[PDB]
Structure formats: C-alpha cells, structure tokens
C-alpha cells in the first residue's frame, strides 16, 4: 500500500520499489528537570513597596 | 577589485607561498605585500617566486604559458613550460627510412564504468 500511495496508483507493475524506511515509534516519555523545590520570588518582584 | 590566487607547495613539505595578483601590472601596488621576487606574467603579477630561464615540464600551472614548481635551500620558482622534446626529421626526395627490427609493447588504459548508486529519503 505504501508503494501504491507513492505511485498514485491502485496498480503496481512488476519490479522493486523503494518504500521509505523502517521506523520505530516511541512508547513512553521522559521528563527531566532539576529537582528545584522553591517558588520564585513573585512577591518581591511584583509586590514591592 | 579583485583577482587573487595562491600557489602552494604542499604544506607537508614547506610553508612558502607565492601569490598571484591577476589584475596587477608591476611593470607594483594593490598587493598585500611585495618583498621582491616580483615577476610579471600575462596572468598577473606573481610575488614570492623566482623566475628562471630554464624551461621544464609543468607541475603547478599558473596560466599564459607560465608554470611553477618548488626546487633548490628550496624555493618557489616560475618558468615558461616546455611543450615537448626538440626533434627533427630529414626530408629528401630520394631517401627512405625502413625499420629493421621491432618492439612488442604493452600499455594500459583505465576507464570508469559505473558510479555509486544511492537513494534518499527526503523525510
């Protein structure tokens, strides 16, 4: 079917067609951020006298 | 304006360099430097090479009959190239040269036949 879509045809002639690449899909995601525990000083920046 | 090219002996031998200024007529400015060894060719003013009167076979071509090489204490030199060996045939209306012996010679010839085949996935 990949060959048929590439060729815009519902008929394929005898021969060898290239069909893109073998692909691998991801299964899960990894999220890594530094282990920061404090909230930023929003009060000091925006609530200053 | 332009016109600059560099004549280099391989760097695994030496770092002497000659520079050709294509639009400069030294017979001397619009150059980066002089330092003597200034020779005018029809291909530009060549600075940093010694012109000699000894014609040789060409090594590094420059243009307009001038070619350079690196030689004896070795420096870059320039010369007008030789086109071939001087020779001469006799011409007479009553004399013929005829071979009396021969040589069997085998020479080689090399030709490409095919190119590496490739394929590209644009994605």
């Amino acid at each position: 079917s990949e060959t048929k879509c590439t060729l815009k045809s519902f008929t394929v002639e005898k021969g060898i067609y290239q069909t893109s690449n073998f692909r691998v899909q991801p299964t899960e995601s990894i999220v890594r951020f530094p282990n920061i525990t404090n909230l930023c000083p929003f009060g000091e920046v925006f609530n200053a006298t | 304006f332009g016109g600059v090219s560099v004549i280099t002996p391989g760097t695994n031998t030496s770092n002497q360099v000659a520079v050709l200024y294509q639009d400069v007529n030294c017979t001397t400015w619009r150059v980066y430097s002089t330092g003597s060894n200034v020779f005018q060719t029809r291909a530009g003013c060549l600075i940093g090479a010694e012109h000699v009167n000894n014609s040789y076979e060409c090594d590094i071509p420059i243009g307009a009959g001038i070619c350079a090489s690196y030689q004896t204490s070795q420096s870059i030199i320039a010369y007008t190239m030789s086109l071939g060996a001087e020779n001469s045939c006799a011409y007479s209306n009553n004399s013929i040269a005829i071979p009396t012996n021969f040589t069997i010679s085998v020479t080689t010839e090399i030709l490409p036949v095919s190119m590496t085949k490739t394929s590209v996935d644009c994605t």
């Binding site: - | 009553n94 013929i96 040269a97 069997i104 080689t108 036949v113």
Partner: protein, 113 residues
C-alpha cells in the same frame, strides 16, 4: 578483434588486447607492435627494365650502396626484383625519378636448361 584505428587501442600498431576488472571500472592491456631500429636507404618510384616501367606490388624499391631490392614497407627484408614482385604499367618516359637496374625473369633459365 583487431583495430586499425590510430591511437584507439594504444600507441603503435595494434595486435590484441586483454581486459582486467577493477572497482567501478575496466582496465585494458593493449599489445602493440612498434618499429625499432631503422636504416637510411636510397629509393625510387620505379625500375626501368626494357623500356617498360616496373612498380612494386607490395613494397618499396630500396637501394643499398650498389644494388636495388624490393622490401615490404614495414620491415627490412630485401628481395630480388623480379617479374613476380613487380607489375608493369606504361613505359619509362613519364615517371619522375625512374632508375634502371634490371628485373629478373625466373623462367628464362628453365627454357635454357
């Protein structure tokens, strides 16, 4: 085959070739014949025998210091000039550079013997 094209299959006269393979290509070994030692001989367009003009059939008329011989063009191997080596066309009046010498007839001694 054997080529007659100048410089097509190498320098000299081509005799034969042998291919060898190579990465992405072909290498040919070309075997040729090259003339070597040579000598300077006197020559002439024709030999005049009895008033008739003799031309070589397959060769050139060649003279050493005292005698005329006929040789193949590419190799110095002198033959006696005979009526079998020459052909006759016309008389000795037209060709420029005609020399005399004689042309041998192999039949006359048989008729005499």
């Amino acid at each position: 085959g054997q080529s007659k094209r100048v410089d097509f299959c190498g320098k000299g006269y081509h005799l034969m070739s042998f291919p060898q393979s190579a990465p992405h290509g072909v290498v040919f070994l070309h075997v040729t014949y090259v003339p070597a030692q040579e000598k300077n001989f006197t020559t002439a367009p024709a030999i005049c025998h009895d008033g008739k003009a003799h031309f070589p059939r397959e060769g050139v008329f060649v003279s050493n210091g005292t005698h005329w011989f006929v040789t193949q063009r590419n190799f110095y191997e002198p033959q006696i000039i005979t009526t079998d080596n020459t052909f006759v066309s016309g008389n000795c009046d037209v060709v420029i550079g005609i020399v005399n010498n004689t042309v041998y007839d192999p039949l006359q001694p048989e008729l005499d013997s």
